From Swiss-Prot, chain B:
It catalyses: a (3R)-hydroxyacyl-[ACP] + NADP(+) = a 3-oxoacyl-[ACP] + NADPH + H(+). NCBIfam families: 3oxo_ACP_reduc, PRK05653.1-1, PRK07231.1, PRK12824.1, PRK12826.1-2. The gene is fabG. Keywords: Fatty acid biosynthesis, Fatty acid metabolism, Lipid biosynthesis, Lipid metabolism, NADP, Oxidoreductase. The lineage of its organism: Bacteria, Pseudomonadati, Pseudomonadota, Gammaproteobacteria, Vibrionales. This is 3-oxoacyl-[acyl-carrier-protein] reductase FabG. Pathway: Lipid metabolism; fatty acid biosynthesis.
From Swiss-Prot, chain D:
The lineage of its organism: Bacteria, Pseudomonadati, Pseudomonadota, Gammaproteobacteria, Vibrionales. Signal peptide: none annotated. GO terms for biological process: fatty acid elongation. The keyword Lipid biosynthesis applies. SMART domains: PKS_KR (SM00822). This is 3-oxoacyl-[acyl-carrier-protein] reductase FabG. It comes from Vibrio cholerae serotype O1 (strain ATCC 39315 / El Tor Inaba N16961). NCBIfam families: 3oxo_ACP_reduc (TIGR01830), PRK05653.1-1 (NF004197), PRK07231.1 (NF005559), PRK12824.1 (NF009464), PRK12826.1-2 (NF009466).
Length: 224, 218, 225, 219
């Protein structure tokens, strides 16, 4: 699809981390519907294969461990070799958890440090090309995400790369009166759908969002 | 396609005769909306009809007169159906007054939006280049209050805040461009994109938001 | 009532012949599901009784389905007060030998049970198609047996503008009205239907979730065929 | 959260639930309060079903062509969750698949008919050999419905048109697909699940022997 030039991502290579279910999957599917060549990531090969299956001719799945440089490097080389340089990066990977030191580093590595590494690694080629999109999906330690987006955006704005945050509210995931209590904080009176997170990411990924950078776009039913 | 498709939507865009307003009206039309753009005069209205063709028309509106608002809404409702998308586009006395139109127009289209449990209101603050900031802050304050009040009935209310956009209004250009990290002025079409996204079925869970379209200027 | 599933909040539903039985059951459930409901009866006192059971969820109006002026005046009043009709349920009819009735009596029977469907449908379609969103549901078991043909034709013509047109075809349903034994022998399920079971079907077809169902006859008849 | 279309207390067996329509069906029955058991051919496929169902059900390995596997799957469901209330059969190659529908159906029917309450829903395939397969399923539905109607069990077919799936996802073969659909779009798996769910509900008790088409006016 993308029968028109409006919001058309044909020719774009999109790397979406954590794409096996929920928001990540919804993101990967829509970027594909819009004509992107999509590479979604999972921690395992079988998870990667399941991503390949739902992407078909519109992309594929790859195993990535966002906390390991070697894996990042090997995943980028394989993407570049087969599809061309990454144009759109969606940092969606994360795990939602007293803990031990090692367990907390692991939580920071996965949810924040990975964002830094992946972003830095795709920026090389984006900035040489003077064209790129980085979108950080962050509503635990994901609160540092907005600060990082604003700093990186200010630094790379002049070379045609945008960096934005999409911040979900309560979204219906795979996971009785705790739902009632959840819904009481949302002025709209319903949970979001993963597809609504994807829409926002897809809009920001488009050629038409070229003058939006440093922005936090909240998708939360007014929760604000 | 079904993506960002406004077919069957009735969109009232105020101040649609040139620049951002025009760019907004055109794109909502390209996306399948039935578009009514407004100007202060009948000849301005006629020029809007000319560029909209079969995809809508122009109407004279004086945003500061209740009778004109009421008569414009009745004519739209009669011919096209109830307004689904309203785009409020276009010195203290000048801020107070324009602000006041936003309230009146909004209140008037909200009746039907809330009965239908479906609506979009988008407030376009003014283009960069004290008074500027005062006006933007007035619009943003109204958006956030009205959004909270109507959110549960399926209506969204958002602000799109332009930066420095290439218009008639806007060497001092060098100095303008120095405040924009992206190193260029925006195009009116980039404002229209943002408004159109927020107008879509797909932006149903975004409300109370200020979406900045300014090249990192913030 | 409390979720986004089968939720008709913000929809305006016109249900003809809503004073009792199936019509009433349909009107009530659309209301329970959040619709703004306008039910019709032939008389004002019948209209009032519909207002009484709808309360804040809608009202009753007198409609004569065989008179264009009455249709036009009923649609204008709905549009003015509630907004454009989103869901139209054609349920009106009289159930009464063709060879012993007079010409004028039979035209009246055709006008009421078939011709009204055409006129009402055409009249609400203007706005549904401008909006690219609508539901038309024709409740008819063998109004007349011409209903299914008319549903299929109108569905094919309006499908692309986001309107669906379907028939719900009841079997033997317990109305206000041995011979019951003989009735029940033709129903594989071995019981009469409840009007509420007709309303369920109409409501499902009325919902955002039935957007890809059009041109269908949904039979609610305990296995008859 | 209301009594309308509420499947709380119902046990639903959905075959082929790992992706697309099957998965969409399993998820919605779960959202509606059903205890859902979805099946896949492999254990890893079963595990992936368990993962997305969580506390609302689980996955089990089933080989629909083997009576011992059917029997062992039903016993494990009955033991843990109670008797199967709703069965969704979600699939020459037509003869065999047809045969699985008969076996599964016959096996769950024992308890449905003792209980005088049950739902069987047969999902024909998504839009020559197509029509031969649909016709086989529809012919079985109508026969079995007539036979079990009096004991409070319904048996219906949901017949999808062109639905957006893995299978149907070139640029101009889609154009040609869409030209046969008066609605001018493909269906979503979720729209198939809606129809199945409606037919699975207490409120569809007086619908049986029906083919409900979900195809945008295609026929």
């Amino acid at each position: 699809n993308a029968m028109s030039q409006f919001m058309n991502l044909e020719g774009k290579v999109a790397l979406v981390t954590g794409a096996s279910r929920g928001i990540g999957k919804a993101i990967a599917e829509l970027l594909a519907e819009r004509g992107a060549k999509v590479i979604g990531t999972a921690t395992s090969e079988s998870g990667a294969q399941a991503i390949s299956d739902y992407l078909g001719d519109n992309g594929k799945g790859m195993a990535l461990n966002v906390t390991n440089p070697e894996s990042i490097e090997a995943v980028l080389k394989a993407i570049t070799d087969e599809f061309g340089g990454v144009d759109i990066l969606v940092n969606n990977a994360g795990i939602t958890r007293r803990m031990k030191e090692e367990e907390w580093s692991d939580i920071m590595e996965t949810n924040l440090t990975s964002i830094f590494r992946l972003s830095k690694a795709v920026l090389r080629g984006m900035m040489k090309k003077r064209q790129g999109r980085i979108i950080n999906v962050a509503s635990a330690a994901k609160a540092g995400v907005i600060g990082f987006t604003k700093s990186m955006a200010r630094e790379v704005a002049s070379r045609g790369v945008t960096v934005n945050t999409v911040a979900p509210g309560f979204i219906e995931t795979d996971m009785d009166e705790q739902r009632t209590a959840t819904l009481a904080q949302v002025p709209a009176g319903r949970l979001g759908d993963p597809r609504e997170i994807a829409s926002a990411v897809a809009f920001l990924a488009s050629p038409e969002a070229a003058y939006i950078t440093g922005e936090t776009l909240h998708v939360n039913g007014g929760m604000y």
